[PDB]
Design a binder for this molecule. Structure first.
Ligand SMILES: CCCCCCCCCCCCCCCCCC(=O)OC[C@H](COP(=O)([O-])OCC(O)COP(=O)([O-])OC[C@@H](COC(=O)CCCCCCCCCCCCCCCCC)OC(=O)CCCCCCCCCCCCCCCCC)OC(=O)CCCCCCCCCCCCCCCCC
Ligand SMILES: CCCCCCCCCCCCCCCCCC(=O)OC[C@H](COP(=O)([O-])OCC(O)COP(=O)([O-])OC[C@@H](COC(=O)CCCCCCCCCCCCCCCCC)OC(=O)CCCCCCCCCCCCCCCCC)OC(=O)CCCCCCCCCCCCCCCCC
Ligand SMILES: CCCCCCCCCCCCCCCCCC(=O)OC[C@H](COP(=O)([O-])OCC(O)COP(=O)([O-])OC[C@@H](COC(=O)CCCCCCCCCCCCCCCCC)OC(=O)CCCCCCCCCCCCCCCCC)OC(=O)CCCCCCCCCCCCCCCCC
Ligand SMILES: CCCCCCCCCCCCCCCCCC(=O)OC[C@H](COP(=O)([O-])OCC[N+](C)(C)C)OC(=O)CCCCCCCCCCCCCCCCC
Ligand SMILES: CCCCCCCC/C=C/CCCCCCCC(=O)OC[C@H](COP(=O)(O)OCCN)OC(=O)CCCCCCC/C=C/CCCCCCCC
Ligand SMILES: CCCCCCCC/C=C\CCCCCCCC(=O)OC[C@H](COP(=O)(O)OCCN)OC(=O)CCCCCCC/C=C\CCCCCCCC
Ligand SMILES: CCCCCCCC/C=C\CCCCCCCC(=O)OC[C@H](COP(=O)(O)OCCN)OC(=O)CCCCCCC/C=C\CCCCCCCC
Ligand SMILES: CCCCCCCCCCCCCCCC(=O)OC[C@H](COP(=O)(O)O)OC(=O)CCCCCCCCCCCCCCC
Ligand SMILES: CCCCCCCCCCCCCCCC(=O)OC[C@H](COP(=O)(O)O)OC(=O)CCCCCCCCCCCCCCC
Lengths: 141, 93, 75, 62, 100, 100, 152, 80, 62, 61
């Protein structure tokens, strides 16, 4: 996508909130400890307890988000992604084709008809005696 | 009987398709002629000739030297200004 | 060994976490039948308004078998 | 309004729901950098703006 | 990869809006009983009658409209002094002969 | 005679019998500029058909005065006499349908 | 006429005179037509991306001649634009509160003429020339100059 | 978005180009190309022009031909 | 360069007499589309008459 | 397999082409790579608007 979005289309830094799905959960998992079981009372708080790099998952997320920036080969995206990347480009190109091979031919026919019959082929011939081509978009009359 | 020798797939496909075409052109060509869809060089419609017969390239009237006709009986100026006479740098014939 | 061409693999799913993205129930992924019904009606109104130019000026004369209070007398 | 991230939030289906809002709230956000933090900030905003009774009066007026 | 708008938003809201505008306009016309038949001509009755006379050959072809009114402004008096419909018709006739 | 005779025949008749009342075609708006322009166009078309001396066209001018301020009429009446009034150009010399 | 090739091959060869088709059907030939600095990044491209790029590029370059034809016809039309009737000066036409001088606040050339009113300026320039003041333009016949688009 | 599979079901490779031998018919190739690059762009791109053209040209019958036989006060000829 | 190259050329005849135009509407209004080379030559001769250089130029035959 | 110089031999036909064809193909290849592209390389390297913003700035140690 063209526009940059910190959450989804973050191409400036390449940050990703979660690790790749390819990695086993034992190797790397999304940072989610909401399901942690209640802490036993006899356990004592050693660390700060503050959300941050003391948590293993968050640490691995930061580490991977920096070490993923160098890779031996490309991670080929599927054709669906590639189509979306240039959706506007392809659509504009087809619009140009339509303007040349659809709009072009009937516009030429209308002008040639206008030459002989004074008004385009999609207009009501007048009887008022006024001269000239008149309107072109008949449905906006 | 005795036509079966001719009746054949290729002889049929060129008979239905070709005949369908024979009627498509015979029925569509007059419409194209009426609606000015045929190429001009191939043929000119009577309406085309009627309009073209009204066109000439020898009218040398109506030369004016002002942007507006402000009514009246005098009308727009029709005489070239003296200061403009002989002001053109025309190459030698 | 066996491999899969990456160009024809399926899109990766959203991760399942406390913060999960789900578009399945929105129904905003593509235009539905209703949208195409709007297009059909637009084409129909466009053609009708031009073909039958006296429709907006109807005739007040009405016979109506089974009188006016029968259901087929309202359409 | 739940206070634990383990307890899910109910969402209807449609184009204006809790799930629809979650998908788009953090699109431009630099602060929702991981699931735990993203959910906490999302619920913080939802609690503050959508669970505020008087806010619904302005929705009617607009 | 996360989506913010409708998957087909541009076509949806463009064609969709046009459709709603067209349909609403038809409904509005029906409620007010507006005539829906397009007329491309002027409605000046006396003028349209003069034009029929030209088409019927009662008034000579290419006769100007100011050659037919019962009041002429100054600029049309100027034009009437140089108007020769008969000469104009002969010139057109000559052109047709040359073309054919 | 008929009670609805004014509406019958034309919408013009209504103000012709009641000159100082609202015209049906412009009563919805306080601004009466468009009303003045229609009334002047109607005076211009009357003279073309009947001449200036006709009592009808003289009254069509009184009707125009009822809605048109004098400073506008004097200016528009000069343009008409010269032959530059756009509301009085004969229809076959109009350019409205040319080049578009 | 060569008979060592089929008719289709001959047509395609001639359409490949500039190598467009060869670069489409050969990745190696496309990458070796890139300048070395950009060839370094070529190995990452997918074949989908490569041919789609060529398709967009080829469609654009093949339509430029058509736009060029349309533009030439436009220039010819403007070069021989038909005369139009002189405008009658209507109720609200040609209203002026002050002279036209915004283009030349100090010199005030052609105060009576409008900014792009070429015929008024020509006669105004002629007056200045008759007054010993040189002005540029409006002196060469159109058919005796290049790029006029008014020649038969 | 909603993750979905690649919908292209056509041939993934024609083989090496050898002087244009053993290749599909031209029209088949055109169809495969649009399948490979997506029909959504084709429909989206051409939609605007198709709509405008259909409406304008439809006036040839709806606005011109029909109209010639629409005016109910025209079929009547004077002095008949 | 576009401006300078155009400024040198004499102005085209934008307008003609209102009356004379409508007395020969078809020829003038439609002459260009039917035959552009002869219409171009006709225009050139009118420019030569409007600016008084007709006897100083030889207009090429069409 | 014989490898020809890039851009000099067509792959669309077994026939290399006639003299005029070969001349056109070879010379367009030369003109693009060694004549036309002189302008592009000159503009890209010698007249970069972004290189000019860092002109006179100390090196990054
Ligand atoms: C009348 C004249 C109209 C002129 C229109 C001019 C348009 C110029 C830009 C066109 C362009 O390049 O668009 C394609 C391009 C498509 O973007 P993409 O990311 O490739 O889209 C991917 C998919 O389409 C799928 O994308 P997605 O749906 O996943 O979402 C990503 C994309 C989705 O968005 C777009 O793609 C935008 C497309 C716009 C098309 C317009 C036609 O997001 C953006 O690009 C967001 C851009 C920032 C929008 C900021 C809006 C600010 C104003 C908000 C309202 C404030 C006042 C409220 C008052 C009332 C209060 C109650 O659009 C942009 O990137 C331009 C964004 C900025 C446009 C600003 C326009 C003015 C506001
Ligand atoms: C910016 C220029 C804009 C010009 C617009 C003009 C519009 C009119 C139609 C022109 C048709 C030609 C194509 C224009 C589109 C752009 C072409 C392009 O991208 O070239 C890239 C090409 C290489 O670009 P690159 O960045 O190195 O490589 C990009 C790609 O990676 C690799 O590129 P690729 O190998 O895939 O090539 C793409 C392909 C795409 O284009 C096509 O295939 C389009 C085919 C259209 C056919 C229309 C029929 O384009 C070509 O094959 C272009 C071949 C040009 C060869 C020029 C050789 C020198 C000619 C010198 C002539 C001197 C005449 C003197 C006369 C003196 C009389 C006294 O650029 C050039 O070679 C530079 C020239 C570009 C074309 C200029 C055309 C000028 C036409 C003048 C006609 C004068 C007639 C006078 C008659 C007098 C009678 C008395
Ligand atoms: C026996 C039979 C008898 C006769 C029966 C006759 C029956 C009737 C026949 C007529 C047909 C009736 C059909 C009714 C049902 C239709 C259902 C249907 O399929 O409709 C949907 C169909 C397509 O809608 P869709 O399904 O949503 O599209 C699917 C897409 O593939 C979804 O994919 P997507 O959304 O991803 O699409 C690609 C998209 C991807 O885009 C994006 O990713 C989003 C980007 C958004 C932001 C863009 C940024 C700004 C643009 C940048 C690029 C600019 C390039 C151009 C620059 C130009 C510079 C000058 O790209 C775009 O679309 C936009 C970008 C491409 C370039 C845009 C160019 C400018 C467009 C705006 C101007 C348009 C007006 C131009 C006018 C001319 C020029 C002035 O629409 C229509 O067919 C139109 C409406 C049809 C119904 C109304 C018809 C009324 C008139 C009927 C008259 C018929 C004749 C009657 C005769 C009667 C005689 C008695
Ligand atoms: C008349 C005035 C205008 C004149 C100028 C017109 C300019 C536009 C011309 C565009 C031409 C684009 C050429 C692309 C390059 C093709 C190269 C090639 O040989 O490819 C072989 C290749 C060989 O296939 P392949 O090997 O790439 O296969 C890829 C791999 N698989 C098999 C998986 C798909 O095939 C093709 O030809 C593919 C491209 C087809 C593109 C067709 C585009 C049509 C454009 C015209 C639209 C007309 C619209 C008319 C109205 C329609 C109404 C709905
Ligand atoms: C057994 C089944 C057989 C079916 C056969 C179907 C045949 C269909 C043939 C369709 C032909 C269409 C021809 C259209 C020609 C248009 C020419 C034209 O107008 O050119 C000029 C015009 C621009 O003119 P201007 O002067 O600029 O004026 C307009 C803008 N101011 O140029 C254009 O429009 C450029 C585009 C031209 C497109 C030509 C389209 C040709 C289509 C051929 C289709 C053949 C299909 C064959 C199918 C066979 C199936 C077995
Ligand atoms: C920055 C913009 C620069 C614009 C420069 C060109 C201005 C221009 O052309 O203005 C003229 C143009 C057309 O007017 P006429 O000449 O009367 O049209 C008669 C046609 N024969 O419009 C104007 O005069 C308005 C100019 C407004 C100021 C423009 C500069 C700021
Ligand atoms: C106009 C002012 C726009 C200000 C907001 C946008 C500024 C902007 O993006 O400019 C930078 C942007 C790219 O710079 P980067 O190094 O990539 O980014 C800067 C550091 N990240 O620069 C440009 O857009 C290039 C500008 C070049 C042309 C300047 C022409 C100035 C014309 C003035 C006429 C009066
Ligand atoms: C600022 C101005 C903007 C432009 C103008 C705005 C106009 C108003 C807003 C329109 C916006 C539309 C966007 C497109 C939405 C869309 O396509 O929305 C599409 C939806 C369907 O959604 P799906 O795509 O999910 O099926 O369409 C519908 O809900 C309608 C289905 C078809 C109904 C057919 C019958 C309709 C009968 C109507 C009768 C009306 C009678 C009126 C009497 C008075
Ligand atoms: C910011 C907070 C906003 C909260 C919402 C405020 C809504 C206020 C609506 C008040 C409407 C009162 C007038 C009704 C019409 C009337 O009397 O109108 C009177 C007329 C004529 O009546 P009679 O001819 O019988 O005298 O009624 C009709 O002709 C038909 C009326 C149909 C009304 C339908 C549309 C309105 C629907 C409103 C639904 C919600 C109502 C909520 C009320 C609190």
């Amino acid at each position: 996508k063209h526009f940059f979005t910190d959450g989804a289309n973050d191409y400036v830094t390449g940050w990703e909130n979660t690790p790749p799905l390819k990695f086993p959960a034992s190797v790397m998992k999304p940072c989610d400890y909401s399901m942690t079981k209640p802490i036993p009372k006899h356990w004592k708080l050693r660390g700060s307890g503050i959300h941050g790099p003391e948590n293993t998952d968050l640490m691995k997320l930061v580490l991977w988000n920096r070490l993923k920036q160098k890779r031996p080969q490309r991670e080929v995206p599927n054709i669906n992604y590639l189509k979306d990347s240039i959706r506007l480009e392809l659509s504009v190109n087809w619009w140009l084709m339509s303007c040349i091979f659809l709009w072009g031919p009937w516009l030429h026919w209308g002008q040639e008809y206008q030459k002989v019959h004074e008004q385009p082929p999609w207009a009501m011939k007048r009887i008022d005696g006024l001269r000239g081509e008149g309107y072109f978009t008949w449905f906006l009359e | 009987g005795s036509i079966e020798q001719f009746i054949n797939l290729r002889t049929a496909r060129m008979f239905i398709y070709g005949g369908v075409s024979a009627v498509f052109l015979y029925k569509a060509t007059p419409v194209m002629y009426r609606w000015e869809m045929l190429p001009t060089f191939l043929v000119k419609t009577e309406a085309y000739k009627a309009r073209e017969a009204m066109i000439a390239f020898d009218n040398m009237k109506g030369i004016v030297y002002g942007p507006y006709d402000k009514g009246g009986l005098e009308g727009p100026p029709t005489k070239i200004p003296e200061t403009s006479v002989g002001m053109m740098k025309v190459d030698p014939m | 060994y066996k491999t899969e061409n990456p160009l024809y693999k399926d899109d990766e799913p959203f991760a399942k976490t406390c913060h999960t993205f789900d578009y399945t129930r929105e129904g905003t992924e593509k235009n539905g039948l209703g949208y195409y019904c709007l297009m059909g009606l637009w084409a129909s109104i466009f053609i009708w308004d031009s073909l039958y130019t006296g429709a907006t000026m109807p005739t007040g004369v009405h016979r109506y078998v089974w009188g006016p209070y029968f259901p087929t007398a309202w359409f | 309004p739940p206070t634990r991230l383990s307890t899910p939030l109910y969402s209807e289906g449609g184009a204006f729901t809790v799930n629809w809002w979650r998908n788009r709230y953090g699109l431009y956000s630099r602060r929702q950098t991981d699931p735990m933090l993203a959910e906490f900030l999302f619920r913080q905003q939802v609690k503050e703006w959508f669970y505020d009774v008087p806010s619904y009066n302005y929705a009617a007026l607009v | 990869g996360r989506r913010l708008l409708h998957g087909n938003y541009f076509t949806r809201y463009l064609f969709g809006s046009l459709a709603v505008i067209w349909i609403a306009e038809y409904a509005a016309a029906c409620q007010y009983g507006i005539p829906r038949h397009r007329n491309p001509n002027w409605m000046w009755s006396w003028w349209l009658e003069k034009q029929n006379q030209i088409k019927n050959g009662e008034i000579p072809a290419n006769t100007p409209g100011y050659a037919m009114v019962k009041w002429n402004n100054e600029a049309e008096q100027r034009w009437l002094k140089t108007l020769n419909v008969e000469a104009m018709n002969e010139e057109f006739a000559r052109r047709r002969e040359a073309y054919y | 005679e008929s009670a609805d005779a004014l509406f019958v025949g034309t919408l013009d008749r209504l103000t012709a019998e009641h000159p100082h009342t609202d015209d049906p075609r412009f009563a919805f708006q306080s601004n009466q500029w468009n009303n003045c322009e229609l009334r002047f166009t109607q005076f211009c078309r009357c003279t073309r058909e009947l001449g200036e001396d006709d009592p009808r066209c003289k009254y069509q001018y009184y009707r125009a005065q009822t809605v048109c301020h004098e400073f506008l009429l004097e200016d528009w009446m000069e343009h008409r006499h010269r032959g530059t009034c756009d509301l009085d150009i004969m229809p076959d010399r109009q350019v409205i349908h040319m080049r578009g | 006429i060569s008979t060592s090739e089929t008719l289709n091959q001959k047509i395609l060869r001639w359409l490949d005179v500039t190598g467009m088709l060869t670069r489409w059907h050969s990745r190696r030939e496309f990458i070796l037509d890139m300048d070395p600095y950009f060839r370094k990044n070529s190995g990452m491209w997918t074949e989908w991306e490569r041919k789609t790029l060529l398709f967009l590029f080829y469609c654009c370059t093949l339509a430029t001649p058509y736009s060029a034809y349309l533009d030439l016809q436009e220039l010819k039309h403007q070069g021989t634009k038909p005369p139009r009737p002189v405008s009658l000066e209507s109720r609200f036409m040609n209203q002026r509160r002050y002279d036209f001088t915004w283009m030349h606040p100090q010199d005030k050339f052609c105060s009576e003429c409008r900014p792009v009113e070429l015929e008024c300026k020509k006669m105004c320039f002629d007056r200045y020339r008759s007054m010993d003041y040189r002005m540029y333009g409006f002196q060469r016949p159109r058919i005796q100059t290049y790029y006029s688009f008014s020649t038969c | 978005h909603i993750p979905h599979p690649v919908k292209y079901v056509g041939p993934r490779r024609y083989g090496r180009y050898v002087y244009g031998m053993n290749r599909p018919p031209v029209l088949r190739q055109v169809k495969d190309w649009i399948d490979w690059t997506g029909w959504n762009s084709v429909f989206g791109g051409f939609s605007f022009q198709v709509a405008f053209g259909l409406m304008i040209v439809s006036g040839v019958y709806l606005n011109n031909y029909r109209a010639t036989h629409t005016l109910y006060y025209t079929n009547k000829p004077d002095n008949q | 360069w576009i401006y300078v190259n155009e400024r040198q050329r004499e102005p085209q005849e934008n307008v003609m007499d209102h009356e004379e135009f409508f007395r020969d509407f078809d020829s003038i209004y439609l002459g260009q589309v039917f035959d552009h080379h002869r219409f171009a030559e006709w225009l050139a001769r009118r420019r030569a008459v409007k600016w008084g250089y007709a006897d100083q130029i030889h207009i090429p035959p069409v | 397999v014989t490898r020809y110089p890039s851009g000099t031999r067509t792959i669309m036909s077994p026939y290399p082409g006639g003299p005029v064809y070969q001349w056109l193909r070879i010379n367009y290849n030369y003109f693009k790579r060694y004549q036309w592209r002189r302008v592009g390389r000159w503009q890209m390297r010698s007249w970069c608007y972004w290189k000019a913003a860092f002109y006179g700035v100390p090196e990054w140690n």
